[PDB]
Structure 1
């Protein structure tokens, strides 16, 4: 084969069930085709191919899809956008993300980087071709990347430019850490439980990896410094409910009698600032009974403080808010090429 770099409109594929009322299933039933029943991955002999996860139009395309999914599926009692108000009915929905495959039309193919320690930019030596990506769950969150894929070998630091502190850092974990979030049967009070032993061990490895990238400086974690609640809290959607969880206990440099269960305090919020950047939305109060989601932490979103150039330290704070980084954390090993 012979190819050239190119962008083109993708289509999606999924295992969505036509009988489900769950909203990702409904969306994917009418906006995606069924998954490839016979996927074939073709290794490319003696092929080195350069990738750049930070300039990858697949990310913008998935982002457009997820905006469309949420716009079609979430039913606010009151939308507030641009100096407008839209009232409507806001019934409780069934919400649980399903994997979505992204696929090339005729004349194009997806190249896949299989170097286990590939950081997202530069040459890839073990390159395969695929017709569709693997199935990516479109999980919206801040601070912690949830229910994703794990790095196969070492923890990976991904950034467009580590030297530029305005550029988000994506940490790719090699070992998931469960986060178990419950609103038990104050109806908005909730909590998340994490195994502190595993978390602290993983976070210690993360600090050592950051030390490799920052000329051995001391790595310090601190809580976010201002912003909207969606960014200063780990925010995510559990069964249709918007959870906001305080992570100060996770970014604790002293534990880097503290090896039991970490319990993060959370609140379910009805009024949110939408990640589509469109303004505020109000939803109904939470459903009755026990509301529970067990998720895998598979990545971390970090921002490094500026102004530490002449100091002995680098300090990192949980970040997020641009969901493109969530999609990028999974699309990093893929790029579209035009077959020539």
Structure 2
């Protein structure tokens, strides 16, 4: 004689997808963290004893939500800004001289053009300084902007900051976030040490290629992760154990000028650089990079054997965003040449200087049809960052190849936030169960 008994509050859960909201630590920023819920000072974490869960780093639904949120915020911040439609004219350009160095020959151009006035009856003649990567010669010389055959440019609002602010992703009531506490977790499979939370840790949306910056570090060893390690069409994600400092600088003292292109509409052009004109660059430490590469090679050999020769060579082919380390340092966008970082072969005090170029017309998120103009920043620019990972690719060396070649990669921003959301999953709580007992309702 058994009867059904109802238990409310049993520990059962299932895999789910839901909308996560934002919490941030308590004004003009691209990602509006001022609209986010305040963060609890001491969040609660519950260790789940004798529980084994299954995680998959490469099929997480939080990554797609983060991608969509970042792109939506980027688009939302660009609506009130000034359209630069009358700037697609024929420029008359000459080379900039007067205290340039031998490395800066032909990188800046002095371009004059006719601009619309606030009166729709007469024109003005103005000039500005443009980088060589923003103009295309058409047949002094006649130039046009890079984008005036594929998209329209919108000038970024100068009061808006691009600085990343940490964001916590939170689940609604009736949902929980499982977290993997294993220190040797490779992103896919069973994780025998599980905890539960309501929010993820602070995650900064840092946009970069070939190098992960300002992120999180591994706790025991350098970690190598891939969806299918024998398929060379898959990117390899490398998580460092200790960070590598990088110092990036633009040493020119820039000047900004304002040109009125219509009633209530201003365009911020570059004036004249005071002082000499020098090249922008980043510095990394040689010994620290050597140590990090040795550790990466040691951990990579566990997938390819004791006696394989492992060599690093620079990138090969693609657009400038993919073939260079591209990032954003205080408003300005840098594209640096990393051919000295990846040049070596491994057989079983000084600095490395990477020269960088600057581009002012930006195409983000691998899209076509929406370009953005970044107004100039005044004065010298300097920033310091930590390299905490890598994105690599492997060449398809067939015919009894005893050596493997790894090249820097990137370009898709989902791999950037897959390196932060790799230990988290979202589950749905189902606290209602029925079981047989020997007791009956009175």
Asked if Structure 1 and Structure 2 have the same fold, meaning a TM-score greater than 0.5 normalized by the shorter chain, the answer is yes
Say if 2:339 is the partner of 1:251. no
Match in the other structure for 2:33: 28
Say if 2:350 is the partner of 1:260. yes
Match in the other structure for 1:200: 290
Pick aligned residue for 2:281 from 191, 202, 222: 191
**Are 1:77 and 1:284, in contact at CA under 8 Å, matched by a contact in 2?**
no
Following superposition, the deviation at residue 119 of structure 1 comes to: 1.1
Q: What is the alpha-carbon distance in structure 1 between the residues aligned to residue 241 and residue 424 of structure 2?
A: 19
Match in the other structure for 1:237: 328
Match in the other structure for 2:70: 66
Residue deviations 1:107-144, cap 9 Å, x none?
A: 11000001011111111111000100000111000000
Q: What is the alpha-carbon distance in structure 2 between the residues aligned to residue 209 and residue 332 of structure 1?
A: 19
Aligned length: 332
Say if 2:230 is the partner of 1:220. no
Q: What is the alpha-carbon distance in structure 2 between the residues aligned to residue 334 and residue 38 of structure 1?
A: 19
Residue deviations 1:139-176, cap 9 Å, x none?
A: 00000000000011010001111111111111000110
**Gapped runs of 5+ residues in structure 1?**
none
Find the residue that maps to 1:66 and give its secondary structure. Answer: helix
Residue deviations 1:275-309, cap 9 Å, x none?
A: 24345624235312121221110110011112346
Moved more, 35-44 or 232-241: 35-44
Find the residue that maps to 2:341 and give its secondary structure. Answer: coil
Find the residue that maps to 2:202 and give its secondary structure. Answer: coil
**Gapped runs of 5+ residues in structure 2?**
1-10, 86-146, 253-272, 431-442
**Cα distance change, pair 45–311 in 1 and its aligned pair in 2 (3 A):** same
Match in the other structure for 1:177: 244
TM-score using structure 2 length: 0.70
Q: What is the alpha-carbon distance in structure 2 between the residues aligned to residue 88 and residue 67 of structure 1?
A: 18
**Within 5 Å, which residues of 2 pair with 1:155-166?**
155-166=222-233
**Are 1:76 and 1:283, in contact at CA under 8 Å, matched by a contact in 2?**
no
Following superposition, the deviation at residue 212 of structure 1 comes to: 1.2
TM-score using structure 1 length: 0.90
Q: What is the alpha-carbon distance in structure 1 between the residues aligned to residue 416 and residue 148 of structure 2?
A: 24
Say if 2:148 is the partner of 1:144. no
Match in the other structure for 1:114: 181
Q: What is the alpha-carbon distance in structure 2 between the residues aligned to residue 57 and residue 44 of structure 1?
A: 23
Match in the other structure for 1:297: 387
Find the residue that maps to 2:58 and give its secondary structure. Answer: coil
Q: Greater share of strand residues, 1 or 2?
A: 2
Moved more, 182-191 or 210-219: 182-191
Find the residue that maps to 2:248 and give its secondary structure. Answer: strand
Pick aligned residue for 2:19 from 9, 26, 32: 9
Q: What is the alpha-carbon distance in structure 2 between the residues aligned to residue 310 and residue 232 of structure 1?
A: 29
**Are 2:362 and 2:374, in contact at CA under 8 Å, matched by a contact in 1?**
no
Q: What is the alpha-carbon distance in structure 2 between the residues aligned to residue 65 and residue 278 of structure 1?
A: 19
TM-align CA RMSD:
2.4
